[PDB]
Amino acid sequence: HHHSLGLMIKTAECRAEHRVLDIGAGAGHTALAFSPYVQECIGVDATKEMVEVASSFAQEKGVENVRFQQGTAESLPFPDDSFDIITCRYAAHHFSDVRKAVREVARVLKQDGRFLLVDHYAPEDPVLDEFVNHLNRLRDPSHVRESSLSEWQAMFSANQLAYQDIQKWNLPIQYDSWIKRGGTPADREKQIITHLNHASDEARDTFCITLNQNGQPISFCLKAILIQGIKREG
Numbered sequence: 001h002h003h004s005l006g007l008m009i010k011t012a013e014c015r016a017e018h019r020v021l022d023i024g025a026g027a028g029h030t031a032l033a034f035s036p037y038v039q040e041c042i043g044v045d046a047t048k049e050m051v052e053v054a055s056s057f058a059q060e061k062g063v064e065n066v067r068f069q070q071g072t073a074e075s076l077p078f079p080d081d082s083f084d085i086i087t088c089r090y091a092a093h094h095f096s097d098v099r100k101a102v103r104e105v106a107r108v109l110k111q112d113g114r115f116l117l118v119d120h121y122a123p124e125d126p127v128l129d130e131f132v133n134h135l136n137r138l139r140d141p142s143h144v145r146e147s148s149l150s151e152w153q154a155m156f157s158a159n160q161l162a163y164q165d166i167q168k169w170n171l172p173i174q175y176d177s178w179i180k181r182g183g184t185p186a187d188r189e190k191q192i193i194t195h196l197n198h199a200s201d202e203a204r205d206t207f208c209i210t211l212n213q214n215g216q217p218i219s220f221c222l223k224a225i226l227i228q229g230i231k232r233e234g
């Protein structure tokens, strides 16, 4: 995943003196990437098991200035106007209330502070929408929703956040490995496979469905993007 991550560093326009907050931080890859360039990274993740991974991994790469902690995006501990940068990467489709999360991002971000949000997203067409969302709840039962770009813009505007699409790009997925990494049972996998085999034309177009002649999926694409948001006023 080095591309999404590099873009954020290019787009973030770091400063020696900045403080960074990585939300849904995971094994903490974003949080570490930033570390050489900013003062301090803080990262939150909901699962405690992930805080530990993150924090030991930090230690393993011996970086002093990043630290992880447990919490949720819908309720960040931190004070208002207390970060220059916030990163959120392939985590939002997991939040149980993305509306609130943005509101919190808004709160805790400083004025003219930047929100670098990377994720994949539903196309505007609701039918294509369901398609890509249903393909992912099937793979990952923890998948809440990948909101659409209209939706992201409406949320940004709703929170005095100035929306800019830095760059889109298709996310190739190699079906076979995607399944492994995701741990899915062969029950669900059969539903995934039916799903991909009965794709509308529009669907197998928009998501690059490539299949073995036996119906067995080779590959497809998610729609990745990097929105950047900047806290202005209302």
Ligand SMILES: C[S@@+](CC[C@H](N)C(=O)[O-])C[C@H]1O[C@@H](n2cnc3c(N)ncnc32)[C@H](O)[C@@H]1O
Pocket (backbone or CB within 6 Å): 023, 024, 025, 026, 027, 028, 029, 030, 044, 045, 046, 047, 050, 071, 072, 073, 074, 089, 090, 091, 094, 095, 096
């Ligand atoms: C798939 S990981 C994303 C990868 C990671 N953020 C990175 O940049 O490398 C999604 C993360 O979201 C966390 N998560 C799920 N719901 C959350 C929530 N409501 N608030 C904060 N984190 C959440 C999970 O623990 C998980 O680590």
